Amino acid sequence: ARWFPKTLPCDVTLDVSKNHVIVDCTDKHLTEIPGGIPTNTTNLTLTINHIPDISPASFHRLVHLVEIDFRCNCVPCPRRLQIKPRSFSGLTYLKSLYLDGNQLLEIPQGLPPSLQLLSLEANNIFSIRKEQLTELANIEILYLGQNCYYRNPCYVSYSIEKDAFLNLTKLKVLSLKDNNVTTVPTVLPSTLTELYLYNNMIAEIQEDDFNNLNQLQILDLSGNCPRCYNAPFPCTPCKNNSPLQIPVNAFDALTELKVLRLHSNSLQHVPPRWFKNINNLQELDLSQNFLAKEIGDAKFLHFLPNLIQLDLSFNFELQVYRASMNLSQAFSSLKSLKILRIRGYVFKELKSFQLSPLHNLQNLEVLDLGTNFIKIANLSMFKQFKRLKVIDLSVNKISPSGDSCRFKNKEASFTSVQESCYKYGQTLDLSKNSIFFIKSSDFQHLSFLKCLNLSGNLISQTLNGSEFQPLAELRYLDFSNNRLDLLHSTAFEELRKLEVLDISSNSHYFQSEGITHMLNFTKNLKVLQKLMMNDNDISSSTSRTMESESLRTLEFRGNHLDVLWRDGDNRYLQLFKNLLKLEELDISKNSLSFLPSGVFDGMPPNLKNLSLAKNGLKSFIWEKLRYLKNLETLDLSHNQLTTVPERLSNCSRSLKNLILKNNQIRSLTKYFLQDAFQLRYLDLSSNKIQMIQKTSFPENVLNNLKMLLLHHNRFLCTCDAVWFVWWVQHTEVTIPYLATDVTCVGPGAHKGQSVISLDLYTC
Amino acid sequence: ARWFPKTLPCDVTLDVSKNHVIVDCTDKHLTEIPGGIPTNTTNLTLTINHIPDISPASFHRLVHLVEIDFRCNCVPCPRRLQIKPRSFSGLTYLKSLYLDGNQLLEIPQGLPPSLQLLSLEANNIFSIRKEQLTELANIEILYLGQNCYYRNPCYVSYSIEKDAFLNLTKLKVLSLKDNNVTTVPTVLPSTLTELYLYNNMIAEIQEDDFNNLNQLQILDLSGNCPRCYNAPFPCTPCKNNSPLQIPVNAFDALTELKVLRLHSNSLQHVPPRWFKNINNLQELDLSQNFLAKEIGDAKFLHFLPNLIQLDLSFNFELQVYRASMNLSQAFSSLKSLKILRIRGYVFKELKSFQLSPLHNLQNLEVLDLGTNFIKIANLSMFKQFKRLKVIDLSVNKISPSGDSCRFKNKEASFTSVQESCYKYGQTLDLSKNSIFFIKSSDFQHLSFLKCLNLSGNLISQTLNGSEFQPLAELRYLDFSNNRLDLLHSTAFEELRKLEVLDISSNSHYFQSEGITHMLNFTKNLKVLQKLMMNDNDISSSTSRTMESESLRTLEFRGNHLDVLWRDGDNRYLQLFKNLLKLEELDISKNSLSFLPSGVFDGMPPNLKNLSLAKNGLKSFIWEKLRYLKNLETLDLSHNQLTTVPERLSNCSRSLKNLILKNNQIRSLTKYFLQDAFQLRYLDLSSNKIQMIQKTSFPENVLNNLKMLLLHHNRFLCTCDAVWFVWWVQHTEVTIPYLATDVTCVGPGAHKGQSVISLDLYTC
Ligand SMILES: *[C@@H]1O[C@H](CO)[C@@H](O[C@@H]2O[C@H](CO)[C@@H](O[C@@H]3O[C@H](CO[C@H]4O[C@H](CO)[C@@H](O)[C@H](O)[C@@H]4O)[C@@H](O)[C@H](O)[C@@H]3O)[C@H](O)[C@H]2NC(C)=O)[C@H](O)[C@H]1NC(C)=O
Ligand SMILES: *[C@@H]1O[C@H](CO)[C@@H](O[C@@H]2O[C@H](CO)[C@@H](O[C@@H]3O[C@H](CO[C@H]4O[C@H](CO)[C@@H](O)[C@H](O)[C@@H]4O)[C@@H](O)[C@H](O)[C@@H]3O)[C@H](O)[C@H]2NC(C)=O)[C@H](O)[C@H]1NC(C)=O
Ligand SMILES: *[C@@H]1O[C@H](CO)[C@@H](O[C@@H]2O[C@H](CO)[C@@H](O[C@@H]3O[C@H](CO)[C@@H](O)[C@H](O)[C@@H]3O)[C@H](O)[C@H]2NC(C)=O)[C@H](O)[C@H]1NC(C)=O
Ligand SMILES: *[C@@H]1O[C@H](CO)[C@@H](O[C@@H]2O[C@H](CO)[C@@H](O[C@@H]3O[C@H](CO)[C@@H](O)[C@H](O)[C@@H]3O)[C@H](O)[C@H]2NC(C)=O)[C@H](O)[C@H]1NC(C)=O
Ligand SMILES: *[C@@H]1O[C@H](CO)[C@@H](O[C@@H]2O[C@H](CO)[C@@H](O[C@@H]3O[C@H](CO)[C@@H](O)[C@H](O)[C@@H]3O)[C@H](O)[C@H]2NC(C)=O)[C@H](O)[C@H]1NC(C)=O
Ligand SMILES: *[C@@H]1O[C@H](CO)[C@@H](O[C@@H]2O[C@H](CO)[C@@H](O[C@@H]3O[C@H](CO)[C@@H](O)[C@H](O)[C@@H]3O)[C@H](O)[C@H]2NC(C)=O)[C@H](O)[C@H]1NC(C)=O
Ligand SMILES: *[C@@H]1O[C@H](CO)[C@@H](O[C@@H]2O[C@H](CO)[C@@H](O)[C@H](O)[C@H]2NC(C)=O)[C@H](O)[C@H]1NC(C)=O
Ligand SMILES: *[C@@H]1O[C@H](CO)[C@@H](O[C@@H]2O[C@H](CO)[C@@H](O)[C@H](O)[C@H]2NC(C)=O)[C@H](O)[C@H]1NC(C)=O
Ligand SMILES: *[C@@H]1O[C@H](CO)[C@@H](O[C@@H]2O[C@H](CO)[C@@H](O)[C@H](O)[C@H]2NC(C)=O)[C@H](O)[C@H]1NC(C)=O
Ligand SMILES: *[C@@H]1O[C@H](CO)[C@@H](O[C@@H]2O[C@H](CO)[C@@H](O)[C@H](O)[C@H]2NC(C)=O)[C@H](O)[C@H]1NC(C)=O
Ligand SMILES: *[C@@H]1O[C@H](CO)[C@@H](O[C@@H]2O[C@H](CO)[C@@H](O)[C@H](O)[C@H]2NC(C)=O)[C@H](O)[C@H]1NC(C)=O
Ligand SMILES: *[C@@H]1O[C@H](CO)[C@@H](O[C@@H]2O[C@H](CO)[C@@H](O)[C@H](O)[C@H]2NC(C)=O)[C@H](O)[C@H]1NC(C)=O
Ligand SMILES: *[C@@H]1O[C@H](CO)[C@@H](O[C@@H]2O[C@H](CO)[C@@H](O)[C@H](O)[C@H]2NC(C)=O)[C@H](O)[C@H]1NC(C)=O
Ligand SMILES: *[C@@H]1O[C@H](CO)[C@@H](O[C@@H]2O[C@H](CO)[C@@H](O)[C@H](O)[C@H]2NC(C)=O)[C@H](O)[C@H]1NC(C)=O
Ligand SMILES: *[C@@H]1O[C@H](CO)[C@@H](O)[C@H](O)[C@H]1NC(C)=O
Ligand SMILES: *[C@@H]1O[C@H](CO)[C@@H](O)[C@H](O)[C@H]1NC(C)=O
Ligand SMILES: *[C@@H]1O[C@H](CO)[C@@H](O)[C@H](O)[C@H]1NC(C)=O
Fold first, then answer.
1. Inter-residue contact B26 to B73 (CB < 8 Å)
2. Count of helices and strands (H, E) across chain A
3. Fold of the B1-763 domain
4. Does any CB of chain B come closer than 8 Å to the CB of residue A508?
5. Distance from CA of A30 to the nearest CA of B (A)
6. What is each CA distance from B339 to A334, A674, B334, B378, B736, in whole angstroms?
7. Which residues of B touch A515 (CB under 8 A)?
8. Which of A79, A608, B356, B725 is the most exposed place for a label (fewest CB within 10 A)?
9. Between chains, do A402 and B460 touch, taking CB under 8 Å as contact?
């Protein structure tokens, strides 16, 4: 509630339905908590700052607070944060509290009984006692990880007294990652659901370690006795490279377990007895181990019928280069398997019969096989994997056939990189491979491919319309980081159903001058929608115009359009005129010092998104914008403009997203925003503007403005801008960083003063 | 003769034995020829400048000139250079003349009969007539190339009248490269020795084309009907991709021919009848052709018993990936073959039996096989090639086994890149290959290897002293652009005879902090002499000191020595102290803002070459140089020093090569060079110095100075430096760019004035 604040430098978000008020003071360099904080707020953000300590009077009048965040307030900085006694007892409605990165020595006392979450990561608490945990009898989620490890050493092994967590009957999630823990803290409460003991120094597991945990769902034991070969981070292998000793009858009481992580445990064998009782396991991680021989046997896979995810990445043997992948026949028992990763299983040749166990997996979607240094791989063997969604053929050497400060979620699963080409259907990610030329015979029996990534292959070829013949249903093609010779206009002609084409980073042949550059090759593409050819350094073009009846988006950044539009050369003025359906243009970083007269007349009639960022436009004309009757998102950021148009209404009748970020403008015209009621977005940040007059900023136009930025510039706070001073502190226009970034240059003592906090009584 | 010049801005070189005087005015921006040119000069250099034309009075008093160079005086610039009539008749002793890059339309007339060389490259002369060549009856070398091609088009085919060169009885070398020539200009004089007709549009060769040439030694026919696939430069294939039609009885009259170039001719067959008469052929070029099938036959090789060089690079077929290299059995007839290049013959697997024809070549030294995309290659097959000097295993994908403005020489042969490792003996250049780990078994039967290049392989391995076991006699090892984990001090221990080690560009594992970095691994290397570990970004080291009893040179540039020598951290102060025999150090680009006191005491006793370039030394102490009793070549270029030492004699008693290039020094001490008789080299260029006093620059010290630089700085030419003005124009000290780079800041009209050309009579 309370809607209107007075001088708070933190953003306020109101949710009437949720009855939640959010205050975000992230990255504000506040030495002390600012005054005037509303009593109706629910979430308080007090992240990285210069707060010396915490006082009971800080939250004296705040009784509705339900979330306090104090993450990374002192990253190892002055002395450690000190908390006065009874500093949290007054928050009866408190439910969540974060104290990560505060260099605390012991667990704070006096916490309210209503607390449900407590985070104490990146601290110096290496001792756990029941006396300090007595007050936390109603806690549900506990985060005590990253207290003693290589980044934040403490030189003392973690000590937990007997039955420390036993009386925490409400505990559900416990994390002890990177805490130098040697022994699992028995006895954990029976209500635990997620346990995170990974990246510790645990060497053995007892048979009664998880005897009472029946509701556990997620168990993590990574980093115990890890595989330290070629590790880019400090680690200590266990002795004799011994594996993490886990008894056969260890996961017996676990019946609701769903996620089990054993990554980087130096395991050599996986007994089937482990998975005898856990019949509902969904995700299993076994990466960074020594299970190369176990993959050939994989006898334990017969006890996982409901498995969804299986990770076996980077299990290669030392000084061993396998001739082929030895997949066990027990892989056919993974009926519900969806994602499979066999990376780091480096081998020479991949054959069709080696993937036979995966032929009957109906629910399999993703097959990851990248980073395996595969030399010989017949692509026609994938004709049986039509139901697969993503097939990974990454940096391995396949060649053509011959003749705590952020992330409040804390413990979260690894989110897979959702590439832009996955949404189009079947994907064959052949990026960074050893393919140096394209044959139509190689891609035979692959008409089902809706996607094909070939970035980084460094292919030097002159396509004439026959290489991608079998790819009849291809919709997305990636050809970045290659050497494409556009000597013919018939390239990609046989890709009838292609929609998006990426030929970026092909600067090699485009840099050479005097050779033909057929830029009209998009005419044959009937259903092409997006074309990305940026960072190509295109300086000449044999074709006068580019023709396309369906292209809508075109990226032409990082090229040389100045030479194409050189003074006295009108050949390429109407280069984009024939693109009738084009709606977005991205001609940026083209070293365009100036725009010759006539280019705007040659722009497509349906242009709607024009960008000229980072170009260096010394003088950009504005009366020529009348030609563009559909322009809405003109962008001139990071340019060297110096003059605003006399009347924006006379320039464009539809511009609504004008941007002039990081420009050099010292003053605005007296009628800059006169009768411009169609404008919605305006940006003038990072400029050299001095003052704004009333006649240039009418309130009628400013009322409908969604967002306006005037931060990080050189406004002068003198008596000549009383109207501006009154308006900035009495309007509802959303101006970000109003009290943090925009300051006053002068005069004299007014250096660094906040405009919204200015009250010139003498004026 | 004449020894002493007056105001010439060109360097003068005297050779009394050769009676030659050389004047070099290269890159001087001279609008007109300066006055005071000696009459005794022999060679005149008048390269790229702003000379408008040539007048007869330019060489009026010069009668001893024997060489005039006028190369690239106007690169397509004002209008073309105009030569007045009878502008060269007065040079009776002229023998050589260069007029390249002058946009001349016709051959200049009135040349003296004593001329022997004439260069007219990069001009607009596309017509040749006997009338203009009548005056050149005594010429020997003619250069008329690059007159009409893609860089300098003329849109007209070259026209040569019948028997134009017939009467040039003294002609020996003729060049017509890039001249758009269609037909060979019959009839060439019988005294021709070198013919250069390459990069032309010749489509056919007549049987009488070379009927009279019996003394010809070098013949070039490259670029005629060229192979235009993947060409980074403009080219036009002949029609029907026809080959250059050469009759069988074409090289019949040629008996002294030694070099024949047929590179890029689209040849398909090489008849043996071509080489029937040329029994003394030494170098043969057949690259960029379609002789992939001909290599399997190679029937013509039986007629080349005296061949020395054979080039067959880049003859791969389009859309064809050969399974293996098909070398003909006729290769055994090349008894005298020394260098063989089979690059661009892309094939999958290389086997031992495929190199059988080369097993009996006693004189074979270099075997080039790079850029072939070889996948499988057993390195043990090279045990039979012990006599070979260089074996090329370049960017192909071999993996570990599984289970006119310059170049006055004009027409010169392609100089092979002499890598630094070739001088050590047998070389196995395995750079940029697909090797990702090292096994001792792979390098078996290779104990004869004196060199091994492994740069760019990106190998991630933790060597412990057993990988390079069979390489007992290895002396040079290159490991640049890799990922070396120095977790053990026993690395390279088994390389007993190693002398030079290069572990540069291994920044990956060295950038990580907290992992061990055993920098004392050089102790085991008993005979190590040079160690290059630059650009490694080394910021921490587990070993306190580096020990080596034989290391003499150490490159440690592009690292982080500031963190190692951080204030309050004296652990790594004596890092290089134990290097007893070290004589050269290259610690540069280390971001060293300042040198903490004590590092000089920890320097090796025998240090002689110290470099601190591009470091950013805000304040470098000088009294600590007394510790270094053997310093001679101290370098502080591209630094931010501001104060010179009070007395250089008191600082170092052996410094003789002090360098302060690109520094920021405004003034020198009044006793900077007092009693410093041991100094030989001094550099103060690109500084902010204002004036020099007499008491700081005694003549006794300056007499023995070999070289001194005071160019490109901010000297002020007022009346306060009369002594300096007198001394700079009356001393014999070699001061480069004395009248071209060093100018006067002021005062007033004295901007840009030459100090050596200053005469202040009013002072
Ligand atoms: C202001 O502070 C409030 C608390 O003081 C915040 O309310 C919290 O909001 C989160 C959601 O953002 C709730 O989390 C719930 O989690 C359960 C369990 O889901 C678990 O599993 C999923 C994966 O399937 C995982 O993503 C979750 O993180 C959990 O691990 C869900 O079923 C719920 O729908 C909900 O997501 C908290 O319970 C809730 N706390 C309280 C006390 O209600 C509020 O978000 C804060 N607002 C801002 C703007 O920061
Ligand atoms: C000043 O001008 C003088 C002429 O006006 C220059 O004298 C010339 O010097 C060059 C050497 O630099 C002489 O070239 C001769 O070439 C023959 C034939 O060798 C040929 O083959 C070799 C490869 O085996 C090749 O490298 C050569 O370039 C030749 O193509 C050699 O046998 C000789 O030893 C010598 O190298 C000229 O003959 C000579 N000209 C005259 C008229 O004597 C002088 O070099 C100029 N000085 C400077 C500093 O520029
Ligand atoms: C995780 O806990 C283990 C518990 O052992 C820590 O190992 C201990 O580390 C300290 C500090 O390096 C060792 O103290 C050392 O003692 C030697 C004398 O033996 C002394 O010369 C050193 O200066 C240092 O004080 C201690 O011995 C060692 N414990 C054992 C059993 O070896 C480990 O450091 C902890 N990890 C982190 C990141 O804090
Ligand atoms: C085809 O495959 C290539 C390589 O696998 C993909 O390129 C990679 O795309 C990812 C995601 O866009 C890039 O990651 C990003 O890197 C930047 C730094 O450049 C970082 O700031 C981002 O946060 C993100 O991590 C990755 O760099 C890029 N790799 C290269 C070599 O460009 C490409 O996206 C694939 N194409 C399709 C259509 O899936
Ligand atoms: C090397 O010599 C050949 C000799 O044929 C040159 O080819 C000629 O090039 C000119 C200029 O492009 C052509 O003139 C053209 O004529 C057409 C009408 O046919 C006109 O529309 C053009 O505007 C141009 O004026 C000429 O036809 C052509 N000769 C032949 C037989 O095709 C070639 O250009 C020369 N190469 C260089 C680098 O100068
Ligand atoms: C081992 O093989 C590698 C690659 O074949 C060699 O590196 C290459 O060395 C040459 C000659 O030093 C470099 O050429 C130079 O390039 C610079 C530009 O960086 C240019 O300014 C010079 O004029 C010269 O052309 C080449 O760049 C370099 N390549 C790489 C990737 O570094 C290496 O020298 C070999 N090692 C031994 C001991 O022979
Ligand atoms: C694939 O892996 C399986 C299981 O490790 C291998 O089968 C074993 O092979 C060894 C060596 O011959 C025998 O001693 C075992 O008795 C075999 N066990 C079983 C259950 O068959 C198999 O040889 C591997 N195949 C390949 C090609 O490496
Ligand atoms: C990859 O596999 C496919 C199919 O298994 C092979 O296609 C065969 O090609 C030959 C010659 O073109 C035909 O005679 C066969 O009938 C094809 N097989 C089928 C099932 O139709 C292809 O040759 C394989 N690739 C390589 C390099 O061997
Ligand atoms: C596209 O390029 C391919 C590759 O060169 C052409 O295929 C060749 O065509 C020529 C002329 O008909 C034949 O002599 C070759 O035998 C063909 N090679 C192969 C491997 O088939 C193809 O004709 C070109 N297409 C167009 C329209 O230019
Ligand atoms: C793209 O433009 C080029 C010209 O820049 C077109 O090439 C011309 O094609 C016609 C028709 O065959 C020929 O008569 C001309 O001689 C060609 N000119 C050149 C310079 O090659 C090409 O056809 C265009 N492609 C498309 C698909 O429109
Ligand atoms: C290596 O090259 C030789 C010469 O081109 C090949 O020998 C020819 O092979 C063809 C095809 O079988 C025959 O028609 C010719 O009669 C052969 N000529 C001779 C002189 O033998 C040979 O087959 C090639 N070998 C490989 C493995 O490609
Ligand atoms: C590369 O060639 C060498 C020699 O030709 C092979 O060395 C053989 O290795 C086997 C098993 O180690 C021995 O039984 C043979 O006696 C060796 N040959 C000789 C001549 O001694 C080596 O195996 C080859 N590499 C590969 C990958 O096959
Ligand atoms: C250097 O590293 C190699 C590779 O690990 C070591 O060779 C292994 O040594 C262990 C211990 O003796 C054996 O169990 C393995 O069988 C060996 N592997 C191979 C491929 O031989 C070697 O011992 C190490 N040497 C030193 C001095 O540490
Ligand atoms: C290089 O220096 C490291 C120390 O930085 C040496 O490692 C020590 O070796 C001794 C002898 O075995 C051990 O007692 C120490 O515990 C080791 N210290 C560490 C930190 O590992 C290493 O031996 C040195 N190598 C050489 C060749 O001198
Ligand atoms: C124009 O581009 C911006 C870029 O963020 C986008 O937000 C906007 O929706 C685009 N406008 C149209 C009409 O597509
Ligand atoms: C500017 O706008 C006014 C008012 O609509 C109009 O009268 C005038 O013609 C316009 N001028 C230009 C150059 O568009
Ligand atoms: C020191 O290095 C320079 C670098 O050019 C070299 O010329 C000089 O000979 C070296 N001095 C000694 C004594 O090796």
1. no
2. 7, 36
3. 3.80.10
4. yes
5. 31
6. 59, 79, 11, 22, 43
7. 231-234
8. A79
9. no
